[PDB]
Nucleic acid binder design. Structure first.
Ligand SMILES: [Mg+2]
Ligand SMILES: [Mg+2]
Ligand SMILES: [Mg+2]
Ligand SMILES: [Mg+2]
Ligand SMILES: [Mg+2]
Ligand SMILES: [Mg+2]
Ligand SMILES: [Mg+2]
Ligand SMILES: [Mg+2]
Ligand SMILES: [Mg+2]
Ligand SMILES: [Mg+2]
Ligand SMILES: [Mg+2]
Ligand SMILES: [Mg+2]
Ligand SMILES: [Mg+2]
Ligand SMILES: [Mg+2]
Ligand SMILES: [Mg+2]
Ligand SMILES: [Mg+2]
Lengths: 64, 128, 396
RNA sequence: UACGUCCCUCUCCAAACGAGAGAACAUGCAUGGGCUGGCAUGAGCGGCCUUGAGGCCUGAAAUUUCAUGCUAGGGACACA
RNA sequence: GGUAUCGUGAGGGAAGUAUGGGGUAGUAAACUCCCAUGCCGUGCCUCUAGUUUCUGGGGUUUGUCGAACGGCAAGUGCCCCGAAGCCAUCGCACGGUGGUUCUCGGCUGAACUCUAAGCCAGAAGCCAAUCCCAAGACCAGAUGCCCAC
RNA sequence: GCGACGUCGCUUUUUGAUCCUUCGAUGUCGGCUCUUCCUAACCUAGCGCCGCAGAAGACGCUAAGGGUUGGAUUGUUCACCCACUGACAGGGAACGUGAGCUGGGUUUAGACCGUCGUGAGACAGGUUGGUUUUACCCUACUUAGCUGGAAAUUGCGAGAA
RNA sequence: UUAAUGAGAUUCCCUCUGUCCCGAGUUACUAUCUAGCGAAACGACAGUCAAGGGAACGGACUUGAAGGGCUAAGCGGGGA
RNA sequence: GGAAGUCGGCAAAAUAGAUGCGUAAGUUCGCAAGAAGCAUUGGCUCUGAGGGCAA
RNA sequence: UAGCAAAGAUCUAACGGAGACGUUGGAUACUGGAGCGGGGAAGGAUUUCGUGCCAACGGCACUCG
RNA sequence: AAUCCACCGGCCCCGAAAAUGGAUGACGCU
RNA sequence: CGGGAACCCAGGUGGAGGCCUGUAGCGAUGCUGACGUGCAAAUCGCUCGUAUGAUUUGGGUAUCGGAGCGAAAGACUCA
């Protein structure tokens, strides 16, 4: 019952993260989830998850 | 009513997410607020406020009118324990009784404002 | 004319340092002789907090629906060793003690409480009471006052202390025993000593005192802040930026008459470290020790294996090793300060205070961080054999 | 010459200073290991990315368990 | 006598208060409750947010150590992130009790009605109580331990 | 519910007197801030009562317990609107409150203007610019200690909830 | 009447913000404690209140109510 | 959130260098004007020209 | 007791000394060429220098001035 | 075998109230 | 000067100005900042005005008490 993060794909156990509804559209989910404010402050800056060594997708690219 | 954190003190310029012509919602005063001393009347996510339009059509400008907050750029902790917030403040412009008044909303109306206004949810593209 | 509601509460004056850190119930519940003899208080140690997720009841709007995150407090509660029995006369100047029978043995941590050094001392505390108890006149002079606790007594109070050698917490730097009289609220005082006389010199564990889904009142001593100013101690106001001699003050603390400063105006002094009570704090789980059940925090919907102790202990406290009690919300302590539970005063008959509870989730994610991992065996699953253990689990 | 208390040291749920809560071969202190957590891939090298969620920091106004290291016992009244 | 622990509690303080909702019920309308919210109060730091002299880790800027490494200077260079701690009606928890009387509905009827005596009853109110302080209220409260002369 | 006509008690945030205190100095209004107090009750609270069928108002009494807002213009008090609200009641505290703040109005020395005056100048007319010192003392309060103490330090003086 | 000029007076708008709603955390330097050094202004005596009367708003009088003593940090009510 | 603070945007923020593009009202034609307003900025390897000494 | 809070942070060795002081070494700094620089006028007139000294003067102290 | 129609007279009831706590001088007296 | 029967369209050159930004210099607007038993019998901080000029400054030299001198505040003339 842990909705996985958006920008770093962490596990967000209930009551820890801070969700976010961008003024935009999404058929998938209108609300974005972020475990750490680092994960979000680095998303208004809008890096990509890959190219960031500690995120999860990087651990699908840098792991092979 | 809900335990929504307050975001929009009196004198805040909310923008209009309702295709009625207006662009701004300079918050005149919160409808329902019980006065406290030196405390600025602060709108919240579900609150209905009184407004003057500061930008948009003139057929509604120099006039005090109502509005319901759609979106809140201040993170309120949902009672389910999920702290959630928006890109931008937003409010529909509404009937003095409370009615939709304006073309269906161009934004993700929040849960705390739909189940306090059965006339907004029926015009909102998404609920969040 | 114009005014505002007054700052702070006049019923907590003077804002004074409590006379002891030990939380002490000033009043015990009303003696309902229609109940069974029991213990109405218990001393726990504030481990820290966490939060949990609950299946909600009590049909409302936020209730009778999906779950809720409610913050809780973990209070480690080792069993208390009863040592004495104390009875009171109901005399017209208020209760007075009419003797105190002690146990024949008296734990070495209890006797530290009657000292302040105990290691340069000669440890004579309770020497002529262990000796004189093995006598016959001892047994006489002991049943002479037990046969008094029924003639003259109305209020019967065992003396319990805490087990701290059974509390392997080190950050509780103290090795004395916290001593607390505990009311018995049964009936027929003749049968009230019968309980007291029975469980004397036996450990009293917290679930024997309390039940799971019911609420207590938490007599405790607030976290101290030293001398706090007027804006922090009373929360009055800050003067404008333009003020001379600074702005964190009360401007007018007196009219011309009365020509004395009142006890009501706000002034700077001891804030915090006050004795508070926190009526109606509701227990959500009273789970037992890891030595007996190393699956504390796994109720029914977290079929994984874990304990209450978060990843990396509670910050500034340690691991919980004893019969913790899980309350709901705040408790007026810093970490490792003794709290005293108490069965409550309020009528407590309500659909918001007498309803039973199941906990669908508890958080063991570390306090020290942000924690994204429960049950550190989940952290190992996220990572891989990184170079720390790789330099040890591949170098053999 | 008693039981004891106090100072000195240490600890910190306490603290402006007193006072308080403590300990006084104890897990006490000091290091290290481990955990937990921050940061975000270390000097150097191979072919710029690779070693590599690396290096570093992590109790210190004072996060948590394990290994090794050292570890005042003297004063002042009490006391006549 | 000292010292120590546990209490007693005279006395002083005193606080919770508004609003909406559902409910039965367009009922010869409210009322135990069920539900929130707001304010006040007392707390707290699990979460969220703020805070950074962990100058933690990183980045960067001029100068600067022969150059890297590494630093340093810019009374903390600036910047991103940042645990701990502190803290927010920015977060969170908690704050629904017994008598007494008067307005008063009323009882008996005297000398027919409530009162002249005999009387229930109850909103506030006051009063204790919960709550905060605590014997200069000098506690013949209880209790632990002990001298010399 | 008051109104003719009227009158009669008690009223101060009242209009002025009085000249009693102060001329080897009680520092000027308004605010800010904070505490208190009163009821002549604005709100909630308690019945009462009507041409008080529900609705909803209507009059009244009891209660100081709690509550009584945010702004625009003004130095303001007041006033006025704006909007919320259950309603935004009225007062005292040296017109509560400057060794607390502020310095907008009073506010002098500069300057301009209007009227006045021969002129210097005057105006309680307008405009602009214009010091705001000291607690380290006693008590009050606020917290923080310590120590004596029952013929409240003494007689041996003797009283046990 | 006027372009330019203005530490001139004034009003609005934009931006911007802790001016504020509503405050919070951090930092030096102080205050705090210490070693050394060390003033002064001021000073009848002093110095708990309420009420009374009074040169009519008392620290002393009257009548009550508190008050053991000595203290450190504050504060700014009073000592017209 | 953005002057709701306050007698008053007081204070603080903000603005900012350079270069390029633009730049109104008014006007004593000089100005206003740095108007307003946008835009680009790094580090690096380069490739361009820009000059003194003769058949 | 107020205070000795604007302006540069002293740290160490071994040496001297009757003893926080001085000297030397090393260290980290500060002034930063409109200087805690080197020279002059005005003014001061022995304040220069060395060797002592350390009573009171250098608002702390001093073996130094 | 008592019971009336009108008034004179108060003691005494209301008429009537403020703002530090509060005064016959205090307790207290009925 | 380019370029086209009048004198406009532009390109440079040059470096004016009681012009602008700004250092010193000289001033002292705001904070009604900090001090107000000062560092100081008027200072300190930041801001700020000006900064080729009717400028600032040195020394010398003139004019002084019912007087001098003043871009004039009855300012200044050894606190
Ligand atoms: Mg000021
Ligand atoms: Mg410490
Ligand atoms: Mg102690
Ligand atoms: Mg370690
Ligand atoms: Mg330690
Ligand atoms: Mg009591
Ligand atoms: Mg009482
Ligand atoms: Mg005033
Ligand atoms: Mg205002
Ligand atoms: Mg005093
Ligand atoms: Mg004198
Ligand atoms: Mg005192
Ligand atoms: Mg004092
Ligand atoms: Mg804006
Ligand atoms: Mg300048
Ligand atoms: Mg010369």
């Amino acid at each position: 019952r842990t909705i996985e993060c958006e920008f770093s794909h962490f596990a967000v156990h209930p009551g820890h993260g801070r969700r976010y509804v961008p003024f935009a559209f999404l058929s998938t989910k209108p609300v974005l989830t972020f475990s750490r404010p680092k994960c979000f402050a680095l998303y208004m800056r809008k890096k990509n998850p890959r190219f960031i060594p500690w995120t999860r997708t990087y651990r699908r690219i840098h792991r092979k | 009513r809900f335990r929504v954190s307050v975001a929009l003190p009196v004198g805040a310029v909310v923008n209009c997410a309702d295709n009625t012509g207006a662009k701004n919602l300079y918050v005149i005063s919160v409808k329902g607020y019980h006065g406290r001393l030196n405390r600025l009347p602060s709108a919240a996510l579900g609150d209905m406020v009184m407004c003057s339009v500061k930008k948009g059509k003139p057929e509604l400008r120099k006039k005090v009118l109502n509005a319901v907050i759609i979106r809140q750029r201040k993170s309120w902790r949902r009672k389910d324990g999920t702290v959630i917030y928006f890109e931008d403040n937003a409010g529909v412009i509404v009937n003095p009784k409370g009615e939709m008044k304006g073309s269906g909303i161009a934004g993700p109306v929040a849960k705390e404002s739909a189940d306090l206004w059965p006339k907004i949810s029926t015009h909102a593209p998404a609920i969040v | 004319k114009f005014e505002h509601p007054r700052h702070g509460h006049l019923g907590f004056l003077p804002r004074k340092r409590s006379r002891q850190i030990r939380g002490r119930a000033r009043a015990f519940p009303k003696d309902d002789a229609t109940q069974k003899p029991h213990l109405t208080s218990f001393m726990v140690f504030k481990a820290g907090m966490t939060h949990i997720v609950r299946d909600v009841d009590r049909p409302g709007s936020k209730v009778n629906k999906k779950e809720v995150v409610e913050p809780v407090t973990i209070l480690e509660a080792p069993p208390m060793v009863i040592v004495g029995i104390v009875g009171y006369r109901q005399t017209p100047v208020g209760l007075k003690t009419i003797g105190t029978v002690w146990a024949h043995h008296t734990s070495v941590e209890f006797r530290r409480r009657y000292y302040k050094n105990w290691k340069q001392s000669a440890q004579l505390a309770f020497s002529r009471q262990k000796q004189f108890a093995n006598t016959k006149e001892g047994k006489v002079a002991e049943a002479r006052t037990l046969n008094a606790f029924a003639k003259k007594a109305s209020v019967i109070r065992v003396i319990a202390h805490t087990q701290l050698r059974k509390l392997r917490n080190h950050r509780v730097g103290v090795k004395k025993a916290h001593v607390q009289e505990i009311q018995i609220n049964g009936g027929n005082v003749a049968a009230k000593i019968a309980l007291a006389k029975s469980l004397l010199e036996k450990e009293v564990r917290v679930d024997s005192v309390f039940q799971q889904s019911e609420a207590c009142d938490v007599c405790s001593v607030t976290k101290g802040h030293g001398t706090e100013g007027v804006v922090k101690r009373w929360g009055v106001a800050c003067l404008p930026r333009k003020t001379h001699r600074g702005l964190r003050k009360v401007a007018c603390i007196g009219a011309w008459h009365p020509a004395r400063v009142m006890y009501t105006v706000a002034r700077a002094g001891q804030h915090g470290y006050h004795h508070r009570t926190q009526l109606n704090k509701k227990i959500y789980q009273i789970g037992r020790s890891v030595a007996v059940e190393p699956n504390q925090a796994t109720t029914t919907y977290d079929l994984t294996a874990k304990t209450i102790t978060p990843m990396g202990g509670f910050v500034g406290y340690g691991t919980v090793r004893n019969d913790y009690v899980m309350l709901k919300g705040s408790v007026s302590g810093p970490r490792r300060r003794v709290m005293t539970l108490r069965r409550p005063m309020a009528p407590q008959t309500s659909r918001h205070l007498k309803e039973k509870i199941v906990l669908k989730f508890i958080d063991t994610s570390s306090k020290i961080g942000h924690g994204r991992f429960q049950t550190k065996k989940e952290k190992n699953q996220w990572f891989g054999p990184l170079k720390k253990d790789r330099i040890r689990r591949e170098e053999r």
